[PDB]
Design a protein around this ligand. Structure first.
Ligand code: HEM
Ligand code: HEM
Ligand code: HEM
Ligand code: HEM
Ligand SMILES: O=C1NC(=O)c2c(NCCCc3cccc(O)c3)cccc21
Ligand SMILES: O=C1NC(=O)c2c(NCCCc3cccc(O)c3)cccc21
Ligand SMILES: O=C1NC(=O)c2c(NCCCc3cccc(O)c3)cccc21
Ligand SMILES: O=C1NC(=O)c2c(NCCCc3cccc(O)c3)cccc21
Ligand SMILES: O=C1NC(=O)c2c(NCCCc3cccc(O)c3)cccc21
Ligand SMILES: O=C1NC(=O)c2c(NCCCc3cccc(O)c3)cccc21
Ligand SMILES: O=C1NC(=O)c2c(NCCCc3cccc(O)c3)cccc21
Ligand SMILES: O=C1NC(=O)c2c(NCCCc3cccc(O)c3)cccc21
Ligand SMILES: [Fe+2]
Ligand SMILES: [Fe+2]
Lengths: 156, 156, 156, 156, 156, 156, 156
């Protein structure tokens, strides 16, 4: 079904953000596992899988709309050097992602692609849940102290 | 069954206290959940539910006694800005509540409304259990330190 | 996540409406039970519980958006003196509630808070189902007569 | 298998009757549900489904006989404005339906299409069962009064 | 264990009231069953059984306190001749019973027979539940009309 | 609940499209079954049933909004004479259907009927899934050839 | 455990190849699904997942050896425009991948990193299995003809 060209451009932009997130979260997960912080490693793994599932749905939608899904261009990964930095890098990425999702929803609404809007709204709900998690973790570091925070994320 | 008018006023005063506590504990619960202190959030949620159940029983008793349950007047919520203050705010509310329960029981006994007394005694037992919980939490903060106390209440 | 100030004001207005409804429906439920109209009492209890669940979600969303949920201000309860009046009172409240929900959805759409809009849309679906129930009950009173209508609501 | 042309014309006439009945009964069912008369709504829904099943068998038989099933021409729906009228509209439609079924059976017998006759006889048995139901409901309205009759059809 | 003489006199007075209630409720139950009002008959049978259980506990307590339980001196049964009167007769009996229970509890408290008091308080709770049932039934007769009220009590 | 007059006109237009699709898909299903192409017949049957379910929800919404659902006017069925034509007829119908759904959603949004919008969005998601199916079938005929395509749809 | 610098460079080269394959196979999978060739889509999805698992093991090994896994550089995806081209693109990629794996194994052997060798040998076994699959499909296209080959991959 031939989609709106600018809708497809927006969907590819969202896909591009998800592809960054997949790799950033996967690498952060495996870093945390290597450091013995396996509760963080497992949670971050599940965040990476969630982004993979969003990317799949975007690819499927773009193809249905007779566009070409762009899996070739990978933007800049934001990789931290310690737990605090890694959490903040994920939050920085998520804030960019939600800004782009909102702009894409505006355009879908304008051209009456209500099904693409609904898909993006569902992804946005997942991204806001991730922001909630990240903001909460950063706040817990301040409340319990970094050493306690890391202690609490050693074991699954 | 026509109840004593002052018993009904006492029951409405206790109901008023329960209505404050429902909202205070529900808000404290959801604050703690938002902050990632999910064990505190869950415990405080169950405290809010318990006050809802007491309020139900008071409403039912007032109607049986042919009075009008007052759910319109809501007194001042005591909302803290951090965990220590929230616990003290709950304790301050509970101490007011048990004072008022004791005065209501005295009156029920004087007019021979022994069934209303039995209801209020059961509620008083619940409120003294809550006081026990709160005093214990405040004491634990002193024994283990605030950072450890909060750490222990991150995960359910 | 820092939410829009006016969105938070709208969510607090909806929450205020839900808090009125919780208490109005709970009292109506317990009045109907006291009168032996237990099918109405049970249905109205479930309506109160559903409003409690909506209030919970509103509180959680307001806190995520870094606002202060207002559980202190309680508006006017519309309490009837007989079944016909109680049902009409509930309907009057629901019609105010849906007006406020629609105005809140408009504003969420305009600041691109699509997740808050989705929550409010879900609440609006619930409130329109309640309107359907209420209009249907008032119509049945006319079709079967008041005595029969009440008879049919004695037994669960 | 090449069927008799007039048999196929009769089958298309019966199919036309069933298509009116599907839509009339479905609308009556949803009107009754909207009004809170759920037992009537459910029973009328099942009547609509039964007509759908008859239409299916007629379509299948017409195609086997190498005719074209007419799903395009929809005759006049008899929609009532209250329960009494709705039941009588259903009964008026059924009495026309059974007259047409008998005339079709006569013709099938004359040209030795005994399998089409058997199908039409089975449909006729179903339509006479519906007539029994309708006559019985109209009689009950007289015996128990309209308000009681409607009361008895509020709840499933 | 040697009981207070006046406590034992009070317990025998309460026992006498229960013995009246056993017979009154049992006869009302069987009258309602004979009339085809089986839901009333069954409910009233269970009321009679409850009074039998209270009488048992009073007899046991009196014997423990080394008194003689008086099962000989049966007071006046309040027997109605139609449903509304039978319910009112039960209510009149229950109101006398609860007045006597309160006076007995006062005396138990004065002489420190706290276990006798607790037994009487439990009986008082049961009798107030019966009062609630009775007042509710009388109110339902007013709200739904006598003919509907009786209709609703034909079947279990 | 008094709905917007023009919303109700749009819902009746969508309902009219669904009524065409029910009959067109049901007839195509039974044609394919008669020809021995039972996998197509079954799939097309389920498409017809899905349109029946959408029509039901539209009728229910129209009645709730105090409109009259139009089941009387039946537009033009697009009936093919072979598999390729039947699939393209279904696709032509679905493309008209989605255009009308988008126009209806625009209007519902403009008059703040967000619940009707949500219903129509869900229907649009179902219709876009049907368009995906149809486009895919037409493409498969080109890729595997008509003879193989039909072979693959003989057995359920 | 400090690894050999050149071993880590080889592991990152193999990782780089796996990252290309993940995306290439995922896109080919979703292209085939969009075209209705669901058995090819499913198989190609499982090939993508298998490459994801290999990449995970490489990332984990590189981190254990105190290197930095390179998830940032993504090489050229080889995307076909039809089934034959897509299969050949996958085969071309696999043949480059196995050449790189053999060179990496040579070096691991030379510096006595026998555990890294064993990991790469297991990956090489998987990639040769994929080559077997791909060569076999290309051969089947020649033996059964493209139309039959595609027909056989419509249904899972
Ligand atoms: C650095 C790149 C990637 C890595 C390391 C990776 C890793 C993984 C792993 C380890 C799994 C779990 C497999 C299992 O044990 O069953 C998985 C699942 C999955 N991956 Fe990836 N993946 C990557 C990229 C992608 C991409 C780009 C996509 C899609 C565009 C994707 C889509 C999926 C899907 C759909 C699943 C299945 C999730 C589920 O339903 O459980 N992955 N991935
Ligand atoms: C008059 C004030 C209230 C009364 C009398 C009341 C009463 C009740 C009762 C009796 C229950 C069922 C408890 C059980 O047996 O499990 C309940 C559940 C609940 N209440 Fe309330 N409540 C009140 C106010 C509130 C408020 C203000 C909130 C939130 C803002 C709230 C949130 C809840 C929730 C979330 C549940 C559990 C619902 C479920 O998932 O089943 N309630 N309430
Ligand atoms: C001193 C007076 C009475 C006492 C203390 C007494 C006590 C009891 C007790 C303790 C039970 C067992 C209840 C249970 O645990 O389920 C019982 C059952 C019963 N009583 Fe009485 N009762 C008395 C008089 C009567 C009278 C006057 C009648 C009838 C006219 C009666 C009819 C029954 C019946 C029908 C049962 C159920 C028996 C069965 O089917 O198991 N009772 N009674
Ligand atoms: C106003 C038009 C119609 C409406 C609203 C409608 C509605 C429905 C609904 C709601 C169902 C049940 C679906 C489910 O939950 O599984 C159904 C079933 C069915 N319909 Fe219709 N329908 C319509 C017209 C037709 C027509 C014209 C035919 C055939 C000529 C038909 C044939 C069937 C059949 C065979 C079933 C399955 C019944 C069974 O075996 O349980 N329908 N319909
Ligand atoms: O990252 C990438 N996404 C892409 O589509 C892509 C390439 N595609 C070449 C056209 C293939 C084709 C044909 C017909 C229907 C289709 O859907 C696709 C090539 C390189 C990279 C990418
Ligand atoms: O918080 C509140 N509690 C209440 O009762 C109430 C109001 N009551 C007005 C009607 C009371 C009535 C009259 C006649 C028969 C009855 O059964 C009851 C009104 C506002 C607020 C409240
Ligand atoms: O109904 C009510 N809702 C409220 O929030 C409230 C009150 N809030 C006091 C400050 C809460 C605070 C402070 C700092 C950081 C936080 O995260 C939260 C006070 C009274 C009543 C209410
Ligand atoms: O296709 C059709 N849809 C319809 O509603 C309809 C007809 N309606 C007659 C009045 C229904 C009525 C009256 C009063 C209160 C109500 O609630 C409903 C008549 C013919 C065809 C249709
Ligand atoms: O209704 C009546 N209740 C009675 O107790 C009673 C009678 N009691 C005679 C003495 C029984 C007794 C009790 C305890 C220890 C003993 O050694 C003996 C005689 C007639 C009627 C009654
Ligand atoms: O079989 C029987 N044994 C009896 O005592 C009895 C009757 N007594 C009537 C007394 C005064 C009265 C009158 C009306 C209701 C009452 O509750 C009381 C009367 C009839 C049968 C019996
Ligand atoms: O309501 C309707 N019923 C119908 O058959 C129909 C139409 N038929 C078009 C030709 C079907 C065809 C052609 C060749 C071989 C076949 O086996 C079948 C057209 C419009 C409406 C209807
Ligand atoms: O792809 C990547 N792998 C990495 O380790 C990495 C970065 N590392 C910085 C912290 C050690 C930084 C950017 C990209 C990557
Ligand atoms: Fe009746
Ligand atoms: Fe073949």
């Amino acid at each position: 079904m031939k989609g709106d060209k600018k809708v497809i451009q927006h969907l590819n932009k969202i896909l591009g953000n998800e592809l960054i997130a997949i790799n950033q979260y996967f690498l952060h997960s495996r870093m945390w596992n290597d450091w013995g912080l396996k509760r963080l490693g497992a949670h971050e793994y599940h965040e990476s899988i969630d982004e993979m599932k969003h990317a799949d749905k975007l690819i499927e939608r773009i193809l249905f709309l007779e566009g070409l899904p762009n899996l070739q261009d990978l933007g800049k990964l934001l990789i931290g050097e310690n737990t605090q930095e890694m959490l903040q890098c994920d939050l920085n990425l998520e804030l960019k992602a939600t800004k782009d999702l909102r702009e894409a929803i505006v355009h879908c609404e304008q051209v009456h692609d209500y099904v693409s809007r609904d898909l993006l709204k569902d992804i946005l709900e997942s991204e806001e849940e991730h922001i909630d998690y990240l903001e909460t973790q950063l706040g817990l570091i301040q409340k319990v102290g970094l050493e306690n925070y890391l202690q609490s994320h050693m074991h699954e």
